[PDB]
Design a protein around this ligand. Structure first.
Ligand SMILES: CCCCCCCCCCCCCCCCCC(=O)OC[C@H](COP(=O)([O-])OCC(O)COP(=O)([O-])OC[C@@H](COC(=O)CCCCCCCCCCCCCCCCC)OC(=O)CCCCCCCCCCCCCCCCC)OC(=O)CCCCCCCCCCCCCCCCC
Ligand SMILES: CCCCCCCCCCCCCCCCCC(=O)OC[C@H](COP(=O)(O)OCCN)OC(=O)CCCCCCCCCCCCCCCCC
Ligand SMILES: CCCCCCCCCCCCCCCCCC(=O)OC[C@H](COP(=O)(O)OCCN)OC(=O)CCCCCCCCCCCCCCCCC
Ligand SMILES: CCCCCCCCCCCCO[C@@H]1O[C@H](CO)[C@@H](O[C@H]2O[C@H](CO)[C@@H](O)[C@H](O)[C@H]2O)[C@H](O)[C@H]1O
Ligand SMILES: CCCCCCCCCCCCO[C@@H]1O[C@H](CO)[C@@H](O[C@H]2O[C@H](CO)[C@@H](O)[C@H](O)[C@H]2O)[C@H](O)[C@H]1O
Ligand SMILES: CCCCCCCCCCCCO[C@@H]1O[C@H](CO)[C@@H](O[C@H]2O[C@H](CO)[C@@H](O)[C@H](O)[C@H]2O)[C@H](O)[C@H]1O
Ligand SMILES: CCCCCCCCCCCCO[C@@H]1O[C@H](CO)[C@@H](O[C@H]2O[C@H](CO)[C@@H](O)[C@H](O)[C@H]2O)[C@H](O)[C@H]1O
Ligand SMILES: CCCCCCCCCCCCO[C@@H]1O[C@H](CO)[C@@H](O[C@H]2O[C@H](CO)[C@@H](O)[C@H](O)[C@H]2O)[C@H](O)[C@H]1O
Lengths: 104, 155, 172, 171, 606, 127, 86
């Protein structure tokens, strides 16, 4: 069932050529012939250029442009609980009424 | 190409069936036009309706991705049978049985969901109770109407 | 069908072994059932009546279809496997290097010097390859897709360029 | 500040005073101080510099006032010269009314966010004011089509006024 | 407000800077992958500050910075909702993406286009963050389709492979069908509420919300790959493993569930929507878990697990528990991304082998991958006090104590049992027994990129669920009273799944051959849904496109009834007019006829 | 063993097709000349594909016939008959009449409700 | 992966055959024809090719496999498919 002698011979001759071709794909020592052309400090300039400069720009943008227009930044108002003291007015929020203080 | 090599009308005579088969690089025995029903097929050969996914992967096709050879007649629906689209390869399970089991599964599940909606599961618990006339004011009720009082008692 | 009776039985043997291996999974269990399956094939090895042999093959195929694995094992780079054609996007034909800018070619002076020799070898051999094919092909074209070797010293096997220079299986 | 508090109202702010019940330090407190020093301060100085330049070049721009011209009701039919002015006026008032509905919608959306989980009851006034303004806007301008005009608006009003007369006639 | 608002925007701006640098040739492409990974790590840190402020006081805000377009009475502004869902999902998504990106540096090292790969991963993330912080529906749509397109580009990464292009286009097709519902919801809200803003939608609180919510459910059905539009998610395994980890934990598949969570103020009042989502979730979770029982591709097993977990989330929506569904999104991200990175570690070590039948004996050969796989499997199955337990267990006991469809509840419980079965399949067949892989052993999990990335997600799969649950404010009334058999249901059925799975697994080692059952083939071939639908629907549509639309109508009947008929008549009339004998006698004989009929018939002389 | 039931989208495996087996010298003759046509077309392609001096596209008449057969050749071979006219009427006029009554009926209902005041349009001011 | 070599491939091809109980490991050489020298049959040859697929982890199509009748041919086929040139 195997190869015929003609089949074997053609494979033999292609094989020599293919292996020579693959060998020629190897790069020479000088190639490629390029044309003319520690963590802390490395991590510091990243924080500077990617965190501080952007937050500077964004804070300036929000503080003097976005927040000077109505309803651009809308916060949910703080939760007020009994016993809290309001900073704006100093009003003291009354405590809740006495519980049955039942425990279990 | 020249006009003699392009598709033509439905072949009427055995001499025209032999010219069409030669034109399409087919054997006259293997050449079969579409039926002459006036739908516009002309003499373009009718080839078996099989996906390109069905062809031998290991053969050295001139167009390996398409699994076509240069010069062979392309199926009328070749673009529908590329390996990205309709597949016709044999299945381990018969097509009709496959449909029965898929439909049967889906119909049964839909039936059982209807039953489960008729007989819902729930806990042996009375309704949850809320204060202040069932939170009438909180839920947006009108403050200018005195609501139908709702009273909840202890137990 | 262009496969002989022998080629069909041998193919059915390998295919049934692979699907058996997919059911068994564990190597020891596979070895046990691969030998029972081999015994079945050996049991009719000498069947002489071609008519009875063909009927045996027909039944074996029917049995294989009934018992095949719905999800058989496929080698990753085989057709249907999970890595089939994964690297086709990285295979770039060699002729694309002719379009490289000179500043790109100057980066690999040694590689492109060899490449020129290969292109020279392709031109100088082409005529003999065409002539050899013409003189070994019967009238009315070839009857098979087989090709001859080179018959002389310095002759290259006709139609070799795209076999020899095809992209590597792992180009990038 | 910059906008009118009456056009864009905001209830008084009531922030509770810190009442730490833990010995641990609050990370937010020290992050806030770092933010003021490293972000707010240098940003503020850069702005104060820019404001010093804008004070040296002070110049003004004005809000265009449009005198009232006769409406399309006063225009003799097919009198284009008077129709044109009334039509241009009607289109100016149409755009302004669109922005009025936007102001009322912006009040409504601000209230819903501000009130949190209590919005369903604490934004009933803004819901009502939005409902009334949207009803008025719909009466004026709805269903006029792409080729709307003062003439079509008048025809819509007259049709509405006729129905109102008839409904009263029933009473 | 100044720090909260400022920091919550730098996070989003920080992630775009690698994109701007790449697109604007101002980068050192030496180690661009490391640059992108570093930026993600820094975004995670800056995102924690807003989250801590929310944890402290529940501080939330909406930022409407840029007015983009006003269409009459519909003002559209670029807005960002920094609320409960935004402030907890973002740090989780960034933390998981931080590991996936470090892992991908090792896993895609040999890729010649690794730089482009990391750019696409970053765009995938940016479009998900746009989606999750969107305050109006138009901004949400931008991110909704952004993740859909990045999914197309990454699934079809190896574009020379026909299967990768079919799978990629399949994802677009199924997600575009879902997008019909998104467009429907937008149109209804604009028409009936005059808004695309989430605040106005909730303030007006429509009562007849059947149509908008059905559209929202249809959109979620496609994006979250629920039954009906489900086959694309397993097919998305064509992509590189880092894509699968990110596409399954964060980004795409969770967007569908997130969209329904965002609209819980509407769904919480519409019972009819709750029933539909519940049944849609229950069939999905059961059907896909059933499919995973017999898969042999390790990525497909994990892929069907995601489908079954998303189905569980839809059930949670269906029982009016949006916050538990959100918690499952957050906890699921940890151990599911870890599981995919563990499978990638195995696949890489066995020369891109993905079939579990060719693994085995890796328990001792890959110790750290083994540990992460077991931790990820136990977390997936609701092992007490691992990250998965803090969402899944509360969901099950909130579902059997609800007023709920009984079939959906029962189907959900069986799926929990099936979860333990396919999980046992991966551990039994990949880690245990004797090796079944080729003879040239190359196992090696000793790269620090691989170890550190998995280690962080391993710490997350242990403690993240505990941390999140103890820091999120309560927004419901947790139902903590129930009979013992409802409390421990999830735990028991899970244990039964492990025991049944172990017996089934051990019986593969017996020397007995058994013909496949009908149910075995149904599970293996995914209920035949892809086999039938992906041949029948393309065939009918594609055949109609050519035979009828293109041939019958365009090339025949529209030609025949106008240009071909009109021109034929003109030709016939021309031959009648011009075919004359040139005979004087005939022309003048016709003159006499004309004069006669001019008088006799038409009275032109009167 | 239940027999294989072939469908349009689930073809018959060759290993189960009787035509594959019981081969005659007449079938082996057909295969030989089929393989000849393929071999002759392959040689014609290879002689051009391998030509060093060729730079361009190897024009394929089979592709040209296919694109021409599915465009320019359709009308010349069209015949108005019972089949084409019924199909043309069904798929050309059919859908248009269908969608007309769907939209006309739906829009007539809506207009009627709007006239009486029974259609909710409380916040509908964008159109 | 660790690159293959012609000597590397040859060693493993012979390694597998030496573990096949129907081949005498002392009469075996890279040039041994499976039928003529080693006395195997075709059913055996299918198993040998099946064992080389498992060994090197890739499939050899049946049309190619049936022609590999000596260990050197298997070595040559594998090196060709894997671009091994040494
Ligand atoms: C005022 C005057 C201003 C003038 C206009 C300024 C903009 C033009 C800048 C010109 C200079 C840019 C440049 O130098 O190109 C370098 C840039 C990097 O060089 P390269 O790596 O060698 O690229 C070669 C490959 O072709 C690169 O191919 P690639 O695939 O690797 O990347 C190219 C990228 C095409 O560019 C992109 O889309 C980048 C991502 C968007 C930014 O393709 C994609 O990524 C497709 C997906 C895009 C994302 C879509 C997902 C939805 C997001 C929607 C959110 C929108 C929110 C707003 O090259 C390009 O990408 C060319 C694209 C030029 C068109 C820009 C389109 C922007 C969108
Ligand atoms: C029934 C009840 C169950 C629920 C039904 C809900 C709808 C779900 C079904 C969606 C439509 C089904 C067709 C999906 C086609 C698809 O997914 O593409 C994949 C297909 C082959 O992919 P695959 O099976 O993975 O093959 C692997 C390689 N052998 O490759 C292809 O053929 C696709 C590329 C060719 C383009 C064909 C386009 C077909 C258009 C029909 C789909 C629907 C179009 C939009 C209308 C639906 C919305 C109303
Ligand atoms: C649903 C929405 C869909 C959106 C689709 C389109 C998406 C495109 C991508 C959007 C890019 C981000 C847009 C936000 C950044 C700011 C955009 C801008 O141009 O700001 C100008 C701002 C406009 O003012 P405003 O009243 O809000 O609207 C005017 C109507 N155009 O005017 C200002 O406020 C002044 C700002 C000055 C800031 C000075 C700081 C500069 C610092 C140096 C930077 C380098
Ligand atoms: C834990 C799982 C929870 C969910 C369980 C859901 C169960 C769903 C069961 C659906 C079963 C439907 O599938 C049903 O199977 C039988 C057996 O083949 C089919 O019947 C078919 O098989 C045999 C022949 O092979 C014959 O009985 C019959 O001629 C044929 O039609 C039915 O036509 C089909 O309707
Ligand atoms: C509207 C934008 C507002 C903010 C504008 C700020 C612009 C500042 C840009 C600074 C440089 C950005 O572009 C890029 O940054 C990174 C990090 O420094 C550098 O990248 C460097 O660090 C990273 C990781 O630390 C390494 O992976 C990389 O090998 C190295 O080159 C690139 O060399 C530089 O080209
Ligand atoms: C919420 C997470 C819950 C995780 C639960 C984890 C699994 C719980 C235990 C499952 C059952 C334990 O396994 C039980 O004991 C031993 C294993 O020790 C098994 O014993 C088995 O050993 C060998 C394996 O070498 C098998 O080939 C053999 O068939 C069988 O006897 C039993 O068949 C099984 O009944
Ligand atoms: C629908 C509203 C307006 C419709 C107005 C249409 C008027 C007709 C415009 C095109 C006029 C072209 O007039 C003529 O048409 C026929 C086909 O139609 C062309 O002829 C071509 O098709 C015919 C029949 O299909 C063939 O017999 C002929 O071999 C071929 O050349 C002529 O080359 C062109 O000269
Ligand atoms: C709504 C009003 C529309 C007004 C449109 C303007 C009408 C212009 C009329 C142009 C008439 C001439 O158009 C004429 O059509 C016939 C179509 O049979 C063409 O004829 C072509 O087809 C016929 C049969 O199909 C062949 O016999 C003929 O060999 C071929 O050339 C003529 O080559 C062309 O000259």
């Amino acid at each position: 069932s195997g190869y015929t002698p003609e089949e074997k011979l053609r494979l033999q001759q292609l094989r020599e050529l293919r292996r020579r071709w693959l060998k020629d794909q190897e790069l020479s020592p000088r190639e490629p012939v390029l044309p003319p052309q520690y963590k802390t400090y490395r991590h510091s300039i990243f924080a500077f250029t990617h965190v501080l400069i952007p937050v500077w720009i964004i804070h300036y943008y929000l503080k003097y442009h976005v927040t000077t227009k109505p309803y651009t930044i809308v916060e949910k108002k703080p939760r007020i609980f009994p016993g809290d003291t309001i900073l704006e007015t100093g009003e003291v929020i009354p405590p809740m009424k006495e519980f049955p203080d039942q425990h279990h | 190409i020249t006009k003699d090599m392009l598709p033509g009308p439905y072949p009427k005579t055995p001499e025209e069936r032999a010219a069409a088969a030669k034109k399409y690089n087919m054997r006259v025995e293997d050449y079969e036009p579409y039926p002459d029903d006036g739908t516009g097929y002309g003499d373009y050969p009718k080839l078996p309706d099989r996906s390109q996914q069905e062809r031998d992967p290991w053969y050295d096709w001139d167009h390996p991705d398409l699994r076509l050879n240069w010069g062979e007649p392309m199926h009328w629906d070749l673009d529908m049978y590329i390996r990205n689209r309709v597949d016709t390869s044999p299945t381990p399970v018969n097509w009709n049985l496959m449909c029965k089991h898929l439909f049967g599964f889906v119909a049964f599940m839909l039936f059982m969901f209807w039953v489960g909606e008729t007989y819902p599961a729930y806990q042996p618990v009375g309704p949850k109770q809320y204060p202040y006339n069932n939170l009438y004011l909180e839920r947006g009720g009108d403050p200018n109407k005195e609501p139908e009082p709702v009273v909840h008692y202890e137990i | 069908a262009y496969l002989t009776h022998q080629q069909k039985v041998l193919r059915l043997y390998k295919r049934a072994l692979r699907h058996l291996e997919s059911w068994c999974i564990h190597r020891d269990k596979y070895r046990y059932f691969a030998c029972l399956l081999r015994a079945r094939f050996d049991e009719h090895k000498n069947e002489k009546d071609m008519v009875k042999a063909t009927q045996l093959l027909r039944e074996a195929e029917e049995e294989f279809w009934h018992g095949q694995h719905p999800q058989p094992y496929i080698f990753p780079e085989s057709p249907g496997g999970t890595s089939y054609e994964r690297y086709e996007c990285y295979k770039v034909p060699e002729w694309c290097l002719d379009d490289w800018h000179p500043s790109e070619k100057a980066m690999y002076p040694d590689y492109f010097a060899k490449r020129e020799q290969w292109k020279k070898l392709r031109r100088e051999s082409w005529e003999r390859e065409v002539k050899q094919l013409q003189e070994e092909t019967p009238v009315g074209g070839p009857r098979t897709e087989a090709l001859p070797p080179a018959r002389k010293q310095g002759d290259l096997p006709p139609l070799w360029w795209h076999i020899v220079t095809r992209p590597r299986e792992r180009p990038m | 500040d910059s906008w009118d508090k009456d056009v864009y109202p905001e209830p008084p702010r009531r922030t509770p005073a810190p009442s730490p019940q833990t010995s641990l330090p609050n990370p937010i407190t020290y992050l806030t101080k770092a933010f003021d020093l490293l972000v707010d301060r240098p940003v503020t100085l850069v702005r104060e510099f820019i404001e010093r330049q804008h004070a040296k070049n002070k110049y003004y721009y004005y809000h265009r006032e449009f005198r009232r011209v006769p409406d399309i009701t006063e225009c003799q039919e097919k009198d284009v010269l008077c129709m044109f002015e009334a039509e241009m006026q009607w289109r100016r008032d149409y755009k302004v009314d669109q922005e009025i509905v936007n102001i009322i919608q912006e009040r409504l959306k601000a209230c819903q966010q501000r009130e949190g989980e209590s919005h369903r009851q604490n934004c009933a006034k803004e819901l009502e004011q939005f409902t009334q303004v949207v009803k008025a806007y719909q009466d004026r301008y709805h269903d006029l089509g792409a080729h709307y005009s003062a003439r079509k608006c008048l025809a819509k009003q007259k049709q509405r006024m006729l129905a109102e007369r008839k409904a009263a006639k029933e009473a | 407000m100044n720090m909260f608002s400022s920091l919550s925007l730098v996070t989003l701006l920080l992630l775009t800077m690698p994109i701007m640098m790449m697109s604007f040739n101002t980068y050192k492409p030496s180690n661009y992958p490391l640059y992108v990974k570093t930026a993600i790590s820094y975004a995670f840190i800056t995102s924690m500050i807003p989250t801590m402020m929310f944890i402290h006081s529940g501080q939330e805000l909406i930022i409407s910075n840029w007015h983009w377009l006003t269409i009459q009475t519909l003002k559209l502004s670029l807005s960002f909702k920094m609320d409960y869902f935004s402030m907890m999902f973002i740090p989780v998504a960034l933390f998981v993406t931080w590991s996936i990106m470090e892992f991908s540096m090792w896993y895609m090292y040999s890729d010649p286009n690794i730089n482009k790969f990391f750019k696409y991963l970053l765009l995938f993330l940016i479009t998900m963050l746009i989606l999750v912080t969107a305050n109006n529906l138009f901004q949400l749509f931008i991110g909704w389709e952004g993740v859909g397109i990045m999914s197309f580009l990454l699934i079809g990464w190896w574009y020379g492979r026909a299967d990768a292009n079919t799978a990629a286009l399949q994802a677009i097709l199924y997600n575009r069908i879902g997008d019909i519902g998104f467009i429907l919801a937008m149109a209804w809200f604009l028409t009936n509420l005059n808004t695309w803003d989430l605040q106005q939608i909730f303030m007006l609180n429509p009562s007849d919300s059947n149509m908008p919510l059905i559209g929202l459910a249809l959109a979620a059905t496609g994006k979250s790959a629920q039954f009906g539009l489900h086959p694309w998610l397993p097919s998305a395994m064509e992509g590189p493993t880092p894509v699968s980890a990110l596409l399954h934990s964060s980004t795409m598949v969770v967007a569908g569930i997130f969209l329904l969570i965002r609209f819980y103020p509407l769904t919480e009042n519409n019972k009819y929507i709750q029933s539909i989502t519940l049944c849609l979730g229950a069939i999905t979770t059961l059907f896909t878990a059933m499919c995973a029982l017999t898969q042999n591709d390790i990525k497909k097993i994990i892929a069907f697990s995601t489908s079954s977990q998303l189905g569980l989330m839809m059930v949670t929506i269906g029982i009016n528990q949006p916050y538990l569904a959100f918690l499952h999104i957050c906890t699921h991200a940890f151990f599911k991304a870890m599981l995919f990175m563990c499978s990638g570690s195995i696949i890489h070590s066995l020369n891109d082998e993905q079939d579990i039948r060719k693994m085995g004996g890796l328990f001792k050969a890959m110790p750290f991958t083994t540990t992460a796989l077991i931790v990820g499997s136990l977390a997936l199955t609701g092992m007490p006090f691992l990250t998965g337990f803090y969402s899944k267990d509360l969901i099950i006991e909130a579902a059997n104590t609800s007023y709920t469809n009984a079939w959906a509840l029962l189907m959900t419980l069986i799926a929990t049992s099936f979860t333990a079965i396919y999980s046992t399949r991966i551990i039994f067949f990949a880690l245990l027994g004797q090796p079944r892989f080729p003879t040239l052993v190359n196992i090696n999990e000793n790269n620090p990129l691989l170890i550190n990335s998995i280690k962080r997600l391993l710490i997350g799969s242990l403690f993240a669920g505990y941390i999140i649950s103890n820091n999120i404010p309560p927004t419901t009334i947790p139902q903590m009273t129930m009979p013992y058999y409802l409390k421990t249901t999830a735990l028991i059925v899970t244990i039964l799944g492990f025991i049944l799975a172990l017996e089934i697994s051990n019986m593969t080692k017996n020397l007995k051959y058994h013909y496949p059952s009908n149910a075995f083939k149904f599970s293996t071939l995914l209920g035949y849904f892809p086999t039938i639908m992906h041949r029948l629907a393309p065939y009918m549509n594609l055949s109609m496109s050519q035979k009828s639309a293109s041939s019958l109508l365009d090339l025949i009947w529209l030609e025949a009834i106008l240009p071909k008929t009109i021109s034929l008549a003109q030709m016939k009339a021309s031959t009648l007019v011009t075919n004359q004998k040139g005979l004087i006698k005939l022309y003048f004989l016709s003159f006499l006829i004309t004069i006669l009929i001019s008088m006799i018939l038409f009275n032109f002389h009167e | 063993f239940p027999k294989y039931e072939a469908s349009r989208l689930s073809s018959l495996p060759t290993t189960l097709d009787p035509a594959e087996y019981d081969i005659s010298s007449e079938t082996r003759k057909a295969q030989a000349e089929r393989l000849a046509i393929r071999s002759r077309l392959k040689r014609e392609y290879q002689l051009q594909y391998y030509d060093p001096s060729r730079r361009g596209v190897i024009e394929d008449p089979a592709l040209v016939r296919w694109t021409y057969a599915r465009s320019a050749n359709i009308y010349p071979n069209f015949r108005p008959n019972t089949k084409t006219s019924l199909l043309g009427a069904l798929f050309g006029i059919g859908p248009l009449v269908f969608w007309y009554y769907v939209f006309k009926t739906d829009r007539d209902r809506k207009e009627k409700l709007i006239q009486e005041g029974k259609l909710d349009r409380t916040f509908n001011i964008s159109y | 992966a660790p690159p293959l070599t012609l000597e590397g491939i040859k060693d493993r091809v012979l390694y597998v055959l030496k573990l096949y109980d129907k081949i005498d490991p002392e009469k075996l050489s890279v040039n041994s024809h499976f039928m003529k020298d080693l006395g195997l049959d075709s059913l055996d040859q299918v198993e040998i090719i099946m064992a080389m697929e498992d060994e090197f982890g890739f499939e050899i199509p049946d049309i190619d496999a049936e022609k590999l009748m000596c260990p050197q041919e298997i070595v040559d086929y594998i090196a060709d498919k894997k671009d091994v040139y040494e």
